[PDB]
């Protein structure tokens, strides 16, 4: 909320190479200042050369602009015309100083950011001194530095949740924490890794049944075709999805070995055989740099399937889904139950189409979920419009400023947490907009905007919710569920 | 030309005539204990003991015989001449420092405190050293083959599948994205394996974890040598967003992720991605005891992806870095383990002969556990080992090397011992496993029958149903 004009200040010089040629130089700058540097900006808002002088090889000038026709774009418009002044009538760009004045209400603490020489507060905003050459300006690095600095200006000026639908409350006769109940009765045990669980037969039958319910009650009637998305995700995929914009604190990073040469690894082996300890420090030195991380969001890697491609109109809506593996996230410390794991199992659902087709597809899923949760699971739940899954996993909060782009969360209560217990999110549906098509460069034959959507069904969360509300004895389950399950298997009884 | 074994230590006790009587004593019977005559075990606040010896009743099991009688430790020298054969490579091994490579053998020089022989470090180093030395002193052999069939499809199925829109390469090394058509085939095998093998034989589905930590591999024995082909996993050193703003801001400004900087900010590896699949299951039964009413435990998993760093090159689905497997695991007594083994072979035979109708063979190979921890050859227990299923890929030619698509292993007591699973009666438990590699099944079937349903066996088509269409582009 500061009205200070966003402004760019370039001080540069050009470098075939005479000295006295200034007639057209004067006449070009005016024919730029009131014509060439106009195009793009609204009336009286284009760029301007404000002063200039000369050398024997070089031609220095000061250049100014606001948000339209920016100096680092304006200067290449100039070199173009200035190249057709002293071509047949009678080589590069250097930068003396680059300054951006950005509007801001609050001070902002200086950080290790590349291409920034200095930064300090001024009247109504912040002034940056950039350390940039011509290569950088073609790359549009000043533009990207401005997007960053604004993101952070928003962040300082500062979570979203608001109701859409709720179920009439139900009597809750099972009041214990399902993970404790399942451990006590042989359904599961803890995995070796953090936030990890080994599912015995009883627990596994629950997951499989939930899975089966999604296939028969949602995925088939709606026309979804199974795919197999990969589970090792690379920077390439996260750059295009946008997760490379800040997912870093929550991923499990993967590093391949630098080589299979077993002589290179001989030293690791030996340590272990002598000490019976694994030398993790030594391994860290022998492993490659990370190539990415374990599946975090599940859809991102599907999009390599359609990257760089065009889709015929006959071929949309593309409705696919994946159930081929585990997702991994580094959650908050503290031991939890299945309601907050690090290794989880999700059925990722994805659709591409037009703005309209996408919403219709989203509506259809909402319909089939309500049938399942009301009629088959018979659980107590609700849904709310929330901060988008793509926004959150990329560091940022708030909502998206397109009416219908965002995430709808499904939440259920857990009777063991008491009347004031925070409810648990267990299902989502998101309209992603044009984000994923744009990012992976996926075009549409007839040339309209491609939109996408996605929904993830966390099995561990369905289980937390269904078991907290119904217990583990089948007799008390909805009989519609009890049909799906068949006969419950026996656990592995220990002594 | 060879030599002997001698140990040599220089050490002082930190705690005259009566002491002078023990020279005659110790060298007569006290230290000629666990060693025949002569070999048993020189120079005399601060005493100082120099002592040579042989292989038996070692110097460090002899300075504690002194610790005892001296009622009536700090080391500054410890050398081990070793009967080595030839000139050998220079190795850095924890408790060693010098590794002199002489003409008659190899001399080593350790560095130990008193609280280093109590745990027997020279034991392990020698064991290792001798285990290595004999370096300069896979197994395969046929059990059964099906007779030849004609091979009307002569094309690389992966090349076919890409041309025909079944799949494309994913972003990572040896990695694939399966389109609808290819996904269906996988699911069809799954349903074959379930309905024809798993359900009939009474296996219950469990979900095994997929991020494996060193403790698992330490117990399972892969921590002895699996390193060259693990995909290592590293958590963040912290979730503090302030600790990552430098990474994020680097990307946002430059459009390149800073992988060197990231490697610095991530923690030491906690372990690796799923490699053999079965190891992590054993944490479910570790330290436990089973009533005999429970054996055989017959269990399986199909909850996700295994990852190995395969040999370099462009390969099709027949050699990938990310794969989908069904891990089948049984525990019981020797006899029960051998019986399940045989039940599966019988059920695979039905599948391969008269559902898929392929040309295949089975051979006795190197145990998978041995291969994956650096070893080769065979197991010394005659009934312990791996049976390997192979099939010809016609596109490879008449001389083509057959592809491994299936195994069945009898692991002996290895896993019950490593993870410490007893049986209530105290008979030794044994285990077995079988890995069903779906891309491998998918490479054989398709290389033998093609991508056109018209020519697949009726039994298969029946189970496939009507093929999904692919996703097409311009
Ligand atoms: Cl992801
Ligand atoms: Cl493993
Ligand atoms: Zn998604
Ligand atoms: Zn196995």
Swiss-Prot record, chain A:
Activity modulation notes: Inhibited by serinamide, unlike type-1 M.barkeri SerRS.
InterPro entries: aa-tRNA-synth_II, aa-tRNA-synth_II/BPL/LPL, Ser-tRNA-ligase_2_arc, SerS_tRNA-bd
Keywords: Aminoacyl-tRNA synthetase, ATP-binding, Cytoplasm, Ligase, Magnesium, Metal-binding, Nucleotide-binding, Protein biosynthesis, Zinc
Binding-site residues, Mg(2+) 2: 409, 425, 428
Biological process according to GO: selenocysteine biosynthetic process; seryl-tRNA aminoacylation
Subcellular location: Cytoplasm
Cellular component terms per the entry's GO annotation: cytoplasm
Enzyme class: ligase
EC number: 6.1.1.11
UniProt catalytic activity: tRNA(Ser) + L-serine + ATP = L-seryl-tRNA(Ser) + AMP + diphosphate + H(+); tRNA(Sec) + L-serine + ATP = L-seryl-tRNA(Sec) + AMP + diphosphate + H(+)
Amino-acid positions noted as binding ATP in the UniProt annotation, renumbered to this chain: 329-331, 340-341, 425, 461
Location (main, coarse): cytoplasm
Sequence positions that bind Zn(2+): 299, 348, 454
Domain of life: Archaea
List of residues binding Mg(2+) 1: 329, 331
GO molecular function, one term: ATP binding
Protein's pathway: Aminoacyl-tRNA biosynthesis; selenocysteinyl-tRNA(Sec) biosynthesis; L-seryl-tRNA(Sec) from L-serine and tRNA(Sec): step 1/1
SUPFAM superfamilies: Class II aaRS and biotin synthetases
Cofactor(s) annotated in UniProt: Zn(2+); Mg(2+)
Family assignment from sequence similarity: Belongs to the class-II aminoacyl-tRNA synthetase family. Type-2 seryl-tRNA synthetase subfamily.
HAMAP family to which the protein is assigned, alphabetical: Ser_tRNA_synth_type2
Stated role: Catalyzes the attachment of serine to tRNA(Ser). Is also probably able to aminoacylate tRNA(Sec) with serine, to form the misacylated tRNA L-seryl-tRNA(Sec), which will be further converted into selenocysteinyl-tRNA(Sec).
Assembly and interaction partners: Homodimer.
Domain characteristics, as noted in the entry: Consists of two distinct domains, a catalytic core and a N-terminal extension that is presumably involved in tRNA binding.
Name of the protein described by the UniProt record: Type-2 serine--tRNA ligase
Organism: Methanosarcina barkeri (strain Fusaro / DSM 804)
Classification of source organism: Archaea, Methanobacteriati, Methanobacteriota, Stenosarchaea group, Methanomicrobia
Recorded name of the encoding gene: serS2
């Amino acid at each position: 909320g500061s009205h200070m004009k966003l402004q760019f200040n370039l001080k540069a010089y050009f470098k075939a190479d005479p000295t006295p040629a200034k007639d057209a130089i004067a006449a070009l700058f005016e024919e730029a200042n009131s014509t060439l540097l106009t195009r793009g900006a609204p009336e009286g808002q284009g760029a301007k050369v404000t002063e200039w002088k000369l050398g024997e090889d070089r031609i220095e000038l000061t250049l100014q602009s606001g948000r339209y026709v920016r100096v680092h774009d304006a200067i290449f418009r100039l070199r173009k015309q200035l190249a057709e002044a002293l071509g047949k009538k009678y080589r590069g760009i250097e930068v003396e100083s680059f300054i951006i004045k950005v509007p801001a209400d609050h001070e902002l603490r200086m950080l290790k950011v590349p291409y920034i020489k200095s930064m300090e507060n001024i009247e109504g905003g912040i002034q940056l001194e950039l350390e940039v050459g011509e290569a950088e300006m073609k790359n549009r690095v000043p533009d990207r530095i401005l997007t960053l600095l604004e993101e952070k200006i928003e962040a300082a000026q500062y979570e979203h949740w608001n109701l859409l639908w709720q179920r009439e409350p139900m009597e809750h006769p099972f009041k214990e924490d399902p993970t404790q109940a399942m451990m006590k009765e042989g359904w599961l045990k803890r995995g070796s890794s953090r936030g990890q669980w080994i599912h015995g037969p009883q627990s596994a039958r629950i997951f499989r049944t939930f899975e089966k319910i999604v296939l028969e009650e949602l995925l088939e009637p709606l026309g979804y075709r199974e795919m197999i998305f990969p589970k090792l995700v690379t920077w390439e995929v996260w750059m295009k999805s946008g997760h490379a914009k800040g997912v870093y604190p929550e991923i499990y990073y993967v590093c391949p070995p630098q080589t299979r040469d077993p002589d290179y690894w001989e030293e690791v082996a030996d340590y272990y055989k002598v000490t019976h300890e694994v030398p993790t420090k030594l391994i860290k030195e022998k492993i490659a740099e990370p190539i990415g991380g374990m599946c975090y969001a599940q859809c991102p890697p599907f999009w390599m399937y359609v990257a760089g491609e065009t889709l015929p109109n006959e071929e949309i809506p593309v409705k696919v889904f994946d159930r081929s593996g585990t997702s991994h996230r580094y959650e908050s410390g503290g031991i939890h139950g299945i309601e907050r794991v690090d290794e989880f199992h999700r059925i990722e659902i994805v659709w591409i189409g037009t703005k309209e087709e996408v919403l219709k597809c989203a509506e259809e899923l909402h319909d089939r979920y309500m049938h399942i949760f009301n009629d088959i699971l018979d659980i107590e739940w609700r849904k709310a419009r929330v901060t988008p899954w793509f926004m959150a996993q990329e560091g940022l909060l708030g909502l998206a400023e397109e009416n219908t782009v965002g995430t709808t969360d499904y939440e259920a209560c857990l009777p063991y947490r008491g009347p004031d217990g925070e409810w648990l999110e267990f299902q989502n549906v998101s309209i992603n907009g044009d984000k994923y098509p744009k990012g992976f460069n996926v075009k549409l034959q007839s040339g309209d905007e491609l939109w996408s959507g996605c929904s993830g069904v966390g099995l561990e969360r369905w289980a937390a919710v269904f078991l907290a509300q119904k217990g583990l004895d089948p007799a008390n389950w909805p009989e519609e569920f009890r049909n799906r399950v068949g006969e419950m298997p026996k656990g592995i009884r220990f002594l």
